[PDB]
Design an enzyme around this catalytic site. Structure first.
Site, PDB file in Angstrom:
ATOM      1  N   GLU A 197      -6.019  99.360  -6.411  1.00  0.00           N
ATOM      2  CA  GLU A 197      -6.082 100.059  -7.236  1.00  0.00           C
ATOM      3  C   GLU A 197      -5.116  99.546  -8.734  1.00  0.00           C
ATOM      4  OE1 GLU A 197      -4.414 103.934  -5.661  1.00  0.00           O
ATOM      5  OE2 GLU A 197      -6.487 104.634  -6.066  1.00  0.00           O
TER       6      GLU A 197
ATOM      7  N   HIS B  22      -1.414 101.476   1.097  1.00  0.00           N
ATOM      8  CA  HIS B  22      -0.118 101.997   0.658  1.00  0.00           C
ATOM      9  C   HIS B  22       0.821 102.947   1.802  1.00  0.00           C
ATOM     10  CE1 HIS B  22      -2.542 102.770  -3.644  1.00  0.00           C
ATOM     11  NE2 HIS B  22      -1.925 101.615  -3.346  1.00  0.00           N
TER      12      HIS B  22
ATOM     13  N   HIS C  78     -11.278 111.714   1.353  1.00  0.00           N
ATOM     14  CA  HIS C  78     -10.995 110.602   0.329  1.00  0.00           C
ATOM     15  C   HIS C  78     -10.791 109.311   1.113  1.00  0.00           C
ATOM     16  CE1 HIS C  78      -7.506 113.512  -0.115  1.00  0.00           C
ATOM     17  NE2 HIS C  78      -7.017 112.279   0.046  1.00  0.00           N
TER      18      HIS C  78
ATOM     19  N   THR D 228      -1.684 108.160  -6.598  1.00  0.00           N
ATOM     20  CA  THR D 228      -2.775 107.681  -7.487  1.00  0.00           C
ATOM     21  C   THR D 228      -3.922 108.602  -7.300  1.00  0.00           C
ATOM     22  OG1 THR D 228      -3.362 106.192  -5.653  1.00  0.00           O
ATOM     23  CG2 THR D 228      -2.413 105.294  -7.667  1.00  0.00           C
ATOM     24  N   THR D 229      -3.681 109.646  -6.404  1.00  0.00           N
ATOM     25  CA  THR D 229      -4.536 110.847  -6.086  1.00  0.00           C
ATOM     26  C   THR D 229      -4.119 112.038  -6.599  1.00  0.00           C
ATOM     27  OG1 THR D 229      -3.978 111.053  -3.761  1.00  0.00           O
ATOM     28  CG2 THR D 229      -5.572 109.666  -4.199  1.00  0.00           C
TER      29      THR D 229
ATOM     30  N   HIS E  83      -7.180 102.057  -0.095  1.00  0.00           N
ATOM     31  CA  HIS E  83      -8.307 102.102  -1.011  1.00  0.00           C
ATOM     32  C   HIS E  83      -9.111 100.846  -1.193  1.00  0.00           C
ATOM     33  CE1 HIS E  83      -5.794 105.552  -3.029  1.00  0.00           C
ATOM     34  NE2 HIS E  83      -4.908 104.671  -2.486  1.00  0.00           N
TER      35      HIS E  83
ATOM     36  N   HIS F 151      -2.339 104.466   4.455  1.00  0.00           N
ATOM     37  CA  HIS F 151      -3.814 104.537   3.886  1.00  0.00           C
ATOM     38  C   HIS F 151      -4.127 103.488   3.119  1.00  0.00           C
ATOM     39  CE1 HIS F 151      -1.807 106.726   0.334  1.00  0.00           C
ATOM     40  NE2 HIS F 151      -3.145 106.125  -0.343  1.00  0.00           N
TER      41      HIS F 151
END
Ligand SMILES: O=C(O)/C=C/c1ccccc1O
Ligand SMILES: [Hg+2]
Ligand SMILES: [Zn+2]
EC number: 4.2.1.1
Length: 257
Positions: free
Chosen positions: A103, A116, A61, A195-196, A93, A91
């Site tokens: 996000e 993040h 992901h 958030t995952t 997004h 990591h």
């Protein structure tokens, strides 16, 4: 299992993970006219001088840069936080297009990406324990926008070729996270979640106001990554962000007047 596609995306998550519809979910929209300056917040302390990275992983992901957290090395403290929170990984997004990727949003504005830096509270002994606690985690969130190159990101950019597909990892020692920070440490803070999946409600969010700028060609290499593993149909790793969730009468505080 869970993903970012039509059939396994954020809108399907609630089925395996009912907390997706819970009371302190992330990310949220930051309404700047509703956030209140908070006098009580102590100054934020980001101490990454002794940071010890280990490796980088494509997990299907995102990619995680992982750190050695078996001592109080890279630590977040101060601000809204009680005690010491040890850096475990970072990591991103990002989007398929510069107009999306982050996000959190600011007054509805989506940035091109969001970083993040995940930290766990050192009074719970380990990460796995900390995520069973409402104050177990602190996340430093930093927005990316497209402009000039972030010199301190280029080493991460450079390694992506070798971790193209799900499950690949490369050595990633002596990376210094200090060159991912913007100048200012002004921030918004609220209680929230990962958030995952599993979307655990264990996070103190610290989201910096000042974005970093990265180059068009830096973000381009992010978007050359694969969701799939080696020798599977190519599915570009893009748009791996969860959209803004209901605030549900949480309070977002600002560190700045
Ligand atoms: O896959 C993830 O999102 C995180 C994996 C992970 C592994 C070890 C420690 C922390 C993590 O977030
Ligand atoms: Hg929790
Ligand atoms: Zn994240």
């Amino acid at each position: 299992h869970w993903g970012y596609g039509k059939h396994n995306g954020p809108e399907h998550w609630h089925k395996d993970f009912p907390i997706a519809k819970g009371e302190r979910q992330s990310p949220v929209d930051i309404d700047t006219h509703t956030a209140k300056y908070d006098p009580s917040l102590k100054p934020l302390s980001v101490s990454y001088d002794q940071a010890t990275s280990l490796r980088i992983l494509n997990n299907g992901h995102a990619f995680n840069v992982e750190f050695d957290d078996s001592q109080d090395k890279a630590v977040l403290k101060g601000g809204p936080l009680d005690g010491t929170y040890r850096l475990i990984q970072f990591h991103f997004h990002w989007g398929s297009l510069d107009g999306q990727g982050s996000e959190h949003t600011v007054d509805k504005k989506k940035y091109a990406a969001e970083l993040h830096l995940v930290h766990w509270n050192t009074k719970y002994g380990d990460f796995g324990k900390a995520v069973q606690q409402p104050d177990g985690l602190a996340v430093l969130g930093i927005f990316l926008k497209v402009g000039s190159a972030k010199p301190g990101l280029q080493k991460v950019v450079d390694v992506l070729d070798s971790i193209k597909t799900k499950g690949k990892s490369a050595d990633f020692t002596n990376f210094d996270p200090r060159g991912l920070l913007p100048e200012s440490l002004d921030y918004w803070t609220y209680p929230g979640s990962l958030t995952t999946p599993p979307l655990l409600e264990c996070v103190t969010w610290i989201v910096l106001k000042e974005p970093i700028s990265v180059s068009s060609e830096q973000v381009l290499k992010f978007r050359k990554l694969n969701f799939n593993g080696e020798g599977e149909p190519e599915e570009l790793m893009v748009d791996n962000w969860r959209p803004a969730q209901p605030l549900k009468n949480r309070q977002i505080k600002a560190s700045f007047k």
